[PDB]
Amino acid sequence: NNNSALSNVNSDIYFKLKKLEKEYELLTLQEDYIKDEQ
């Protein structure tokens, strides 16, 4: 349904965002560079 097995919804979202946030460490690197570039 939409609330039948809510713990399967919780697990997929938590797992995938862990991978994406390493790549979001690369976006804080990009922000640090352009402050020097200008």
Partner: protein
């Protein structure tokens, strides 16, 4: 109400009403939090006193007030002072607030202390009350019976104990395959997220044992582990499992997989062990890779689709007595026909070749080894009339055959090493002539490939004496060759000797060759190689800095490390020596091979700058990153670089575009047609500049490269592992703007896109349609296409294991494994 009554009770000195007061305060501590915060040192005085039982209660009040204050660290200190009354907030719809921050606080402590020691469970840095909360929260994930949550958060906390227990308990075999799947998620999550090498090493190695307790399992999963750690003992142990089965199909299949995936240096120690474990010589033939190369030869022999008329139109436009023009074509056609021995180039252009001399004639000879790349059986034979001592007309042909012979045995030249070395040691006593230099130059490039990653100190010594001759072209060629042979070793003698020699030499060519040869040596050595990088950039010499960029590229290849990437970005913008800047951007693509998705966002910044060399380095980096898989955004950043008037920028961009779109069609990317015609237009003009015509024609051959049988595979998806071979092809390719022969190295990066089914008992937009079409065995099958392939349920050839779903060798079980059914002949069988 007011917190005013609550104060009164604290100021009153009767014991009964102070004990009462804490209970009143915690009841409405979600209404009066700001108010009671002002007179809270009173409550610390009660907490200290042991005239109370409500020391727990006194402490628990502080926790709630500090969270609402905004200070989370202290809220948790008082959480742990309070003792209990915290397991009731794990099921409330109001306050879970204080609990969650504790979990976050664990992760802080763990990171500091895992690096010091794995054991931090005996450490007192970690509070036991802090542990209990983190540990039971992960346990509650398993009570709801989703295990990903428990493995996901345990990796972060550096928890080895809980990850060990979790998988061990998941072995419950109600499907062997279901247990293996849970192992796959964790193997992925460690590698891509955690750069901490020490934790990663433990987590991969532990996975092996859980697979192998189960009898039916995936050996693709077992093999993955072996290549990440590069431990030859797991490998021999994997074979020990398979020798107990006496299973012909699995051992042969994972062996083909293994040679591609695992390091060349790794294979050499592995075979010596298998001989003494006791194995059949069939297997040890595979592990050499000589059979496996022939299987690739066949695939290319059959399917290569090449435009011979395009070769003529380019031939007409690009003159042969015009030397630069002649080179572009030789190289280009060499890539297009690359893979199988095709004598079409020779016959098409039969008078045209002889028109050229100097390095244009050097390239044409060595371009034969790009076309005839692989073809090991016939390796000496086809290059035979161009060999020193059967050719003497030109010094160029004599040298350029040795180099072309080296491509032929590139990664395969265990025999070839001695044969090339004889010529070098004969020529290393000379002071050398310019006649000799051209012969000696191709020997040194060739032996480099032949001895690539075989750790020949014989070759290191031999080429050191050539560098010490101080010869014009050969000193640079020798320098490259040592780096190739001694790839990855990180030998400190070699590192220092070459670093010093740059000042010693007075030739610029020779200086450039050393700087980048140190790059090759510090491959995969990341921050063990930090020290040399720092020094190379410290050099006031542009050539040493130019190689420094690539030394980062290779030390930190295929791991997205912010430090590696930061040094490159900063040098690139901040420096005034144009070579160095250009190199640095190209290095970015190499570091970030793995996260190839982030690359266009990062390097859009650099292409924006209108400095020529910056733009030129941008183009190759996108080329490198998206070579195996194309991205729309990647392509766009290149499109206004074919419309920049500077021709160096045009050369790079055209090659990059064909690098991204190698065998991609126009019903697969509607931009394929537009870009392809742009190259043809430059070739037609003879009123465009020669720099441009040179870039355009090289790219043209790259677009049809291999006969459109190959595409570049930076990283295999065989077991999900980086492909070393391709890195070396790409980085040597990038040296071509400064030395035209070195272009030819792109051939190492071409990887066949095919499924080769083998019968095991002799070893002979948004695409998906619900309408199949039939594909024949050993035809070009793209990586994208491999997942839309599914064996027919009941077929005569059925894959032995559950199909990996990507290009490579899949050994088949033939249902009736004895019939005389039609076979595809093999290049090995064609001989004998």
């Amino acid at each position: 109400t007011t917190a005013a009554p609550l104060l009164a009770l604290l100021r009153e000195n009767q014991d009964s009403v102070k004990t009462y007061a804490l209970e009143s305060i915690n009841n409405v501590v979600d209404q009066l939090w700001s108010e009671i915060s002002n007179e809270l040192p009173d409550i610390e005085a009660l907490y200290d006193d042991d005239t109370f039982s409500d020391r727990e209660m006194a402490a628990l009040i502080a926790s709630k007030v500090y969270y609402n204050l905004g200070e989370y660290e202290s809220a948790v200190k008082y959480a742990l002072a309070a003792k209990d009354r915290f397991d009731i907030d794990e099921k409330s719809q109001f306050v879970e607030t204080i609990v969650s921050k504790s979990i976050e606080m664990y992760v802080q402590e763990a990171s500091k202390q895992y690096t010091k020691d794995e054991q931090f469970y005996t450490k007192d840095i970690i509070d036991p009350k802090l542990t209990s909360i983190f540990e039971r929260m992960i346990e509650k994930c398993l009570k709801a019976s989703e295990l990903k949550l428990a493995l996901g958060i345990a990796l972060e906390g550096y928890r080895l104990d809980i990850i060990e227990s979790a998988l061990k308990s998941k072995l419950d075999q109600d499907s062997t395959s279901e247990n293996v799947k849970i192992i796959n998620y964790l193997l992925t999550l460690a590698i891509t997220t955690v750069t901490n090498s020490k934790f990663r090493s433990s987590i991969l190695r532990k996975s092996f044992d859980f697979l192998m307790n189960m009898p039916n399992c995936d050996y693709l999963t077992l093999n993955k582990v072996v290549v990440n750690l590069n431990d030859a003992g797991l490998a021999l142990q994997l074979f020990k499992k398979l020798k107990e089965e006496n299973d012909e199909g699995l051992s042969a299949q994972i062996a083909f997989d293994l040679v591609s995936s695992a390091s060349q240096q790794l294979l050499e120690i592995l075979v010596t062990e298998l001989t003494a474990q006791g194995y059949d010589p069939a297997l040890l033939n595979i592990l050499s890779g000589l059979p496996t190369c022939d299987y690739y030869n066949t695939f290319l022999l059959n399917n290569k689709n090449i435009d011979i008329g395009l070769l003529n139109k380019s031939k007409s436009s690009l003159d042969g007595k015009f030397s630069l023009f002649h080179t572009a074509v030789s190289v280009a056609n060499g890539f297009m026909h690359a893979g199988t021995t095709d004598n079409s180039f020779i016959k098409a252009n039969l008078p045209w070749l002889g028109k050229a001399q100097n390095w244009a004639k050097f390239t044409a000879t060595a371009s034969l080894g790009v076309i005839h790349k692989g073809n090991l059986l016939e390796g000496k034979k086809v290059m035979a009339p161009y060999l020193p001592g059967s050719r003497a007309s030109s010094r160029f042909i004599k040298g350029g055959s040795l180099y072309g012979l080296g491509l032929i045995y590139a990664g395969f030249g265990r025999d070839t090493t001695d044969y090339l070395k004889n010529i070098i040691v004969e020529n290393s006593g000379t002071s050398g002539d310019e006649d000799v230099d051209v012969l000696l130059h191709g020997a040194s490039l060739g032996i480099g490939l032949a001895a690539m990653g075989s750790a020949n100190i014989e070759v290191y010594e031999a080429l050191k004496e050539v560098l010490y001759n101080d010869s014009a072209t050969s000193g640079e060629a020798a320098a490259l060759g040592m780096g190739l042979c001694m790839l990855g070793t990180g030998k400190p003698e070699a590192i220092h000797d070459m670093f010093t020699y740059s000042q010693e030499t007075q030739h610029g060519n020779i200086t450039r060759g050393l700087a980048v040869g140190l790059a090759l040596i510090n491959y995969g050595r990341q921050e063990l190689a930090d020290d040399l990088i720092t020094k190379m950039l410290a050099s006031d010499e542009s050539l040493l800095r130019y190689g420094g960029a690539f030394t980062i590229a290779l030390a930190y290849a295929g791991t997205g490390n912010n430090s590696a990437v930061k040094r490159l970005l900063h040098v690139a913008v901040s420096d005034s020596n144009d070579d160095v800047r250009r190199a640095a951007v190209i290095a970015l693509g190499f570091v970030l091979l793995r996260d190839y998705t982030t690359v266009p966002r990062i390097v859009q910044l650099l292409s924006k700058s209108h400095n020529a060399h910056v733009r030129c380095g941008t183009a190759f980096a996108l080329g490198i990153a998206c070579a195996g898989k194309g991205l729309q955004s990647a392509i766009d950043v290149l499109d206004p670089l074919t419309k920049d008037p500077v021709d160096f920028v045009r050369q790079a961009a055209m090659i990059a575009l064909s690098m991204i779109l190698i065998q991609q069609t126009e019903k697969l990317n509607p931009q394929v047609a537009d870009i392809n015609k742009n190259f043809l237009s430059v070739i037609t003009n003879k009123h465009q500049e020669g720099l441009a015509k040179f870039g355009a024609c090289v790219a043209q051959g790259i677009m049809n490269a291999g006969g459109r049988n190959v595409t570049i595979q930076l990283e295999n998806a065989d077991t999900g592992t980086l492909d070393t071979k391709s890195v070396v092809g790409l980085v040597m390719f990038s040296q071509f703007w400064y030395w035209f022969p070195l272009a030819h190295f792109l051939s190492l990066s071409f990887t066949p896109t095919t499924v080769i089914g083998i019968r095991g008992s002799d070893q002979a937009k948004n695409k998906y349609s619900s309408k199949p079409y039939k594909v024949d065995n050993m035809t070009r099958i793209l990586p994208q296409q491999s997942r839309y392939i599914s064996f027919i349920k009941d077929d005569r050839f059925v894959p032995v294991r559950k199909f990996k779903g990507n290009n490579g060798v899949v050994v088949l079980r033939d249902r009736e494994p004895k019939e005389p059914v039609a076979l595809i002949e093999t290049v090995r069988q064609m001989k004998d």
